[PDB]
Amino acid sequence: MFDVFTRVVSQADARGEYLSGSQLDALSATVAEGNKRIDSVNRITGNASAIVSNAARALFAEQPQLIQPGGNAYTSRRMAACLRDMEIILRYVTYATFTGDASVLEDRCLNGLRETYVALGVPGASVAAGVQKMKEAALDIVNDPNGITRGDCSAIVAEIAGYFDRAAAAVA
């Protein structure tokens, strides 16, 4: 996998060049963003089970065809699979937020998830709706101003929204 440092290191190694000064200033800017990034990771990690449960509950309330008898989230095994699918997608969104690059989310989460969901008959649109529900829950928790120092945090929120967009796009 790659993070925000080894991405430009790998590009510099393939180009055979050193890191230019603008790349070093961009990496220093990511270092300055890093404390806010750690807070975002901590908040989604702390409220991960609530995010997964509330997003699943909203998804099954909006789409009762999943939980109906004969549905795709019907019975215990398929429901446990759906709940751990939300758990894994949220976990890899936090991983991509932590690294500052989507490479862990691209490779170790979404590489073949659409084809798997098509092969099993899993509705990828419902998974995308659940990913959007985890988007709105996690972004509401990260943007909560209580119990944390103030500051501009729109960039890490936009990065998390982009990771959630990537998770929702790669399932349907």
């Binding site: 095994r77 699979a81 751990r84 758990e87 894994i88 798997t116």
Partner: protein, 197 residues
């Protein structure tokens, strides 16, 4: 690296040819080569858990959820699932950290190759494989071993091999009996302050 120091094989039941019909005291083949129901896949995963972690570490915290999900989708073979069980954090902390390299080699040979160690010399020979290549290098050596393959291959849960001979009530002691740690870690836990009354 270095070649493994030579160790002599000690006669065990798995060395000779098995003149038996499988019958009662055969270890059931848990294989993915036939297409399985999700229930049968669950019993195969539980059999792999029972082989690697024993019955005691079949708890929910020790379940490898993503590894199970990838194994259901046939992203990995049974051998790769056994590797992921051996590379699991729970296995490393519960079994590897509470043992030295010698007893962990004995544990991994029993729970992956399905046979006991021949002597202390085999434990000595593979303990330096642990000490240089890490636990992943050692597990990989054991899982790429021709023994592991000619016995279980890629798509069969490992099992104790030839534990009991035909028409015998009792045979060799089962691999389940071996504890996470020996008497040294027992008395070290006693010395740190546990287990007293």
């Amino acid at each position: 690296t270095l070649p493994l120091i030579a160790y002599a094989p000690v006669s065990q039941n798995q060395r000779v040819t098995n003149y038996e019909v499988s019958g009662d005291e055969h270890a059931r083949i848990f294989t993915t080569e036939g297409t399985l129901s999700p229930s049968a896949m669950d019993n195969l995963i539980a059999a792999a858990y029972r082989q690697v972690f024993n019955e005691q570490q079949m708890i929910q915290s020790n379940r490898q959820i993503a590894l199970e999900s990838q194994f259901k989708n046939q992203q990995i073979t049974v051998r790769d699932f056994i590797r992921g069980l051996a590379l699991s954090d729970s296995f490393r902390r519960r079994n590897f950290e509470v043992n030295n390299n010698y007893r962990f080699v004995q544990m991994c040979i029993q729970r992956l190759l399905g046979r006991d160690v021949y002597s202390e010399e085999e434990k000595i020979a593979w303990s330096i494989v642990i000490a240089t290549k890490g636990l992943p290098g050692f597990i990989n050596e054991l899982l790429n071993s021709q023994e592991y393959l000619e016995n279980f291959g890629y798509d069969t849960v490992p099992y104790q091999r030839r534990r009991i001979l035909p028409q015998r009530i009792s045979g060799e002691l089962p691999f389940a009996r071996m504890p996470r740690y020996g008497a040294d870690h027992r008395e070290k836990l006693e010395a740190i302050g546990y287990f007293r009354n």
